[PDB]
Design an enzyme around this catalytic site. Sequence first.
Site, PDB file in Angstrom:
ATOM      1  N   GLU A 103       0.861  -1.312   0.046  1.00 58.96           N
ATOM      2  CA  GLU A 103       0.155  -0.013   0.008  1.00 58.96           C
ATOM      3  C   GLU A 103       0.829   1.277   0.025  1.00 58.96           C
ATOM      4  OE1 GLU A 103      -3.161  -0.045  -0.573  1.00 58.96           O
ATOM      5  OE2 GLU A 103      -3.742  -2.056   0.337  1.00 58.96           O
TER       6      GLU A 103
ATOM      7  N   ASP B 197      -6.560   6.525  -6.019  1.00 59.78           N
ATOM      8  CA  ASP B 197      -6.164   5.298  -6.429  1.00 59.78           C
ATOM      9  C   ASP B 197      -6.682   4.705  -8.136  1.00 59.78           C
ATOM     10  OD1 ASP B 197      -8.595   3.926  -6.245  1.00 59.78           O
ATOM     11  OD2 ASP B 197      -8.233   2.723  -4.448  1.00 59.78           O
TER      12      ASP B 197
END
Length: 175
Positions: A11, A20
């Site tokens: 992450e 994202d």
Amino acid sequence: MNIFEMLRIDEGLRLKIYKDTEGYYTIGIGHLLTKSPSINAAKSELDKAINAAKSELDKAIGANTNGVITKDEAEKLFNQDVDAAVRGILRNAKLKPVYDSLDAVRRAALINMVFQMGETGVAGFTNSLRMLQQKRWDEAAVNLAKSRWYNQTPNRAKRVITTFRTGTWDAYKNL
Ligand SMILES: [Cl-]
């Protein structure tokens, strides 16, 4: 290696809100906030969406953050989110039996998927879950790659899949 170190690698750590690949405003170590509008969606729409993400963050932190957090805060949301992923697996009738059948390393790979896609999303991988429960690792690996998940984040999916294949942390060594 452990689930925290594994997810920190997958992450990353960003102290300001970012978008994202799925179009979600995110911050910290994969902490999802809200959906973003179209790259076109009106000037007003954009500001609205961003403020909605900032509102979610403030609610999560308990302070007026203006879209920026400290490393300590990112780690707190991360501890909560890992806890939530595990709790989600254990309360889910489809995921719990698979999780209970796996060894510690493979359990981490399943938590990784749930952290990225949510309980309901992973519980939907019916055929892969059955292969995992049957310890048909290579078959599960082939099946897991036939997915939007793999196509959208291939490098990360490959590391998680390799973890289910081998039951080792080899995919995360030297990272
Ligand atoms: Cl939260």
